[PDB]
Amino acid sequence: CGRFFQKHQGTCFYFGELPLSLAACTKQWDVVTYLLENPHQPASLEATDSLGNTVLHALVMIADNSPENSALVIHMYDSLLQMGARLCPTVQLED
Amino acid sequence: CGRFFQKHQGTCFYFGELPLSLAACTKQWDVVTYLLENPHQPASLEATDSLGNTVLHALVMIADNSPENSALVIHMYDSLLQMGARLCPTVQLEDICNHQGLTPLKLAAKEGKIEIFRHILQREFSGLYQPLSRKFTEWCYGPVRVSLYDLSSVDSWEKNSVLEIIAFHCKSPHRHRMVVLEPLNKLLQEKWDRLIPRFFFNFACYLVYMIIFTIVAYHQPSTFGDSMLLLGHILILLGGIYLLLGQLWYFWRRRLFIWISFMDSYFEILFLVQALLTVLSQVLRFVETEWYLPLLVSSLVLGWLNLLYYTRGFQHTGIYSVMIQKVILRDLLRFLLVYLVFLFGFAVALVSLSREARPVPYGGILDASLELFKFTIGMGELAFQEQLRFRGVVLLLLLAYVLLTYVLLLNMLIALMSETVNSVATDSWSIWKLQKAISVLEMENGYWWCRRKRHRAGRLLKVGTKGDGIPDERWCFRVEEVNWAAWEKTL
Amino acid sequence: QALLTVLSQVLRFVETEWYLPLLVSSLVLGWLNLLYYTRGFQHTGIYSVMIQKVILRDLLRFLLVYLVFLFGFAVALVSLSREARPVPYGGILDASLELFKFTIGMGELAFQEQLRFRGVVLLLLLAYVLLTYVLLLNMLIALMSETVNSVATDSWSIWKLQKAIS
């Protein structure tokens, strides 16, 4: 949580203030998988930042109306939802 | 150097009057290389012709807006620059003063070559030939890019900048497309955002001045009141003198601008006329001449119409004034010509055939024209004059004039403006940006009595190192932009 | 409208002369308020949407330029209408009224013989008439012609949004 990472009118870039959120926002599917089933310390997929946004919220925030950005956001959202189905099936991330 | 090789209006072909320039201009890269590292006698790459142009200048001169020509010129320019990097690295070929005192960038800006201008303004190279670049990248954390455009001889802080050349020296028809491409863009917006206060202060001063003008012109004769009237009159005289001096200084400073652009300003001449009329009326009052009031009233009208200069501060109304100008210039004059010819032709006729005694209308050439203009406005008295037995001829003439004028010319005028507005709705924004750029450039200087200090644009930043010693520094202009397509390929 | 109606009703008890203007203004505003309920049909709701777009896009720039021009000419005609060689253009209110009449199509463009500034007054009147009635109004027609064609595409979605809000 820093001025460069908080969302405001300036020279910032909001991604969710979470390493998993940063990995998801940067079209890096190789690290997202490794962050979730690493034996040592898995990263919770329902984790939240100071603002309250989650990974799906962070994906929504960085979304634009550009075709490539929209495709990236849609694909990452679907992949993250499908992965969350196979890790925490007793809780839904949409709600 | 011959008549066929000198640049003029004829059957000539200018290439630079140098064998190396000829080789470069003819897309012959095989001979250009051999001319530079031949052991016997190498050809200097910084050589100049009689006109003063160099190889890069010659490439700029032959440049057009055609895609193939633009590609050829760009490729040859880049290749020649890269070669000059490896032959004479102690001297840069970009900074070569022409006889008229220009560089390839300034020459391209003046001649109107848009494509080579945009290429030179934002050119980027790879790791090799890194110093020979204008656009850079400081940090690209995530999908955001920080572009560092070079502000060398393009910032107004220098005496002869590219912006000033574009504004006041370029005679190309569509020169407004150069103030909306890259760097020159953001820079002008940032300058205008800081020059807002002075612009609106000048507008407020002019508004107060003309408010005083109107109050004085209203309360005038056909004590305290006389004292206030005298104070207002002397204030108006001083204001008119100030405006006259300012306009005279502007015209004297930019004498070679009226011929280049006789209508792009359109308001400095109007301000000059208004100030001259005000001063003339004020000085003529002392002569006690009856024509004081008409001059004062005309000056008041012109000055009150002059407030539309200051409407170029908003996105919405500046374009409106631009379309006003386009409509006035494109289809108002042809209609006026045809209308005046038709009106005179009919007025002379009605005057001639209005003398049969079987006050009378159409007594003179002034009355008939007035009646026809009334017909145009919607107040024409189309009646059946019973005092002369040419009733039928007069009525038929009136109907013939009415049909073709009120039913055909005016409706066609409406249609013509309907076409013109749709046609010029695309380039009006660029013309407004050019007008704002001209206003910013004029406000960068001070008044005729106080020269403002220039504030240098951009900032000095670490950009590479010169290939012969310690790092070099140049002034850049940061611009951040969030692009995902640019970011997604570099992975 | 409701505030004006209530204010007029309560002011009647005070026995104030300005009861009738308030009541009449409230009546006008309420009768114009019936165009809210036209957003129930495909045909007229879009018409009201284009009405709003035309009012917002090109009605205000024209009004600004027109008011500036009208004031500039009215002050002039008032100033130079005092030569004795009732008279027209006596005050700033009369000259503006005459210029508006010119705009409507009822302007009395005559040759006033009671003052020897006939030429100056006539030239000023002609200069005002040309640029106003021949240039600004026709250009306004063209501007609405452009605006209607431009907003003919998104008007349906705006009408759907209005219906959704309702």
Curated annotation (Swiss-Prot), chain B:
Residues 250-255, 312-332, 415-491 are cytoplasmic. The keyword Membrane applies. GO terms for biological process: positive regulation of axon extension; positive regulation of calcium ion import; positive regulation of cold-induced thermogenesis; response to temperature stimulus. Residues 277-290 are extracellular. It is found in: Cell membrane; Cytoplasm; Melanosome. Keywords: ANK repeat, Calcium, Calcium channel, Calcium transport, Cell membrane, Cytoplasm, Glycoprotein, Ion channel, Ion transport, Membrane, Phosphoprotein, Repeat, Transmembrane, Transmembrane helix, Transport. It catalyses: Ca(2+)(in) = Ca(2+)(out); Mg(2+)(in) = Mg(2+)(out); Na(+)(in) = Na(+)(out); K(+)(in) = K(+)(out). The keyword Glycoprotein applies. N-glycosylated. The chain crosses the membrane at residues 199-219, 229-249, 256-276, 291-311, 333-353, 394-414. Residues 359-381 dip into the membrane without crossing it. It comes from the Eukaryota. It is a multi-pass membrane protein. Abundantly expressed in spleen, placenta, skeleton muscle, lung and brain. GO terms for cellular component: axon; axonal growth cone; cell body; cell surface; growth cone membrane; melanosome; plasma membrane. GO terms for molecular function: calcium channel activity; monoatomic cation channel activity. ANK repeats lie at residues 15-50, 51-99, 100-126. Belongs to the transient receptor (TC 1.A.4) family. TrpV subfamily. TRPV2 sub-subfamily. Calcium-permeable, non-selective cation channel with an outward rectification. Seems to be regulated, at least in part, by IGF1, PDGF and neuropeptide head activator. May transduce physical stimuli in mast cells. Activated by temperatures higher than 52 degrees Celsius; is not activated by vanilloids and acidic pH. Homotetramer. Interacts with a cAMP-dependent protein kinase type II regulatory subunit (PRKAR2A or PRKAR2B) and ACBD3. Interacts with SLC50A1; the interaction probably occurs intracellularly and depends on TRPV2 N-glycosylation. This is Transient receptor potential cation channel subfamily V member 2. It comes from Mus musculus (Mouse).
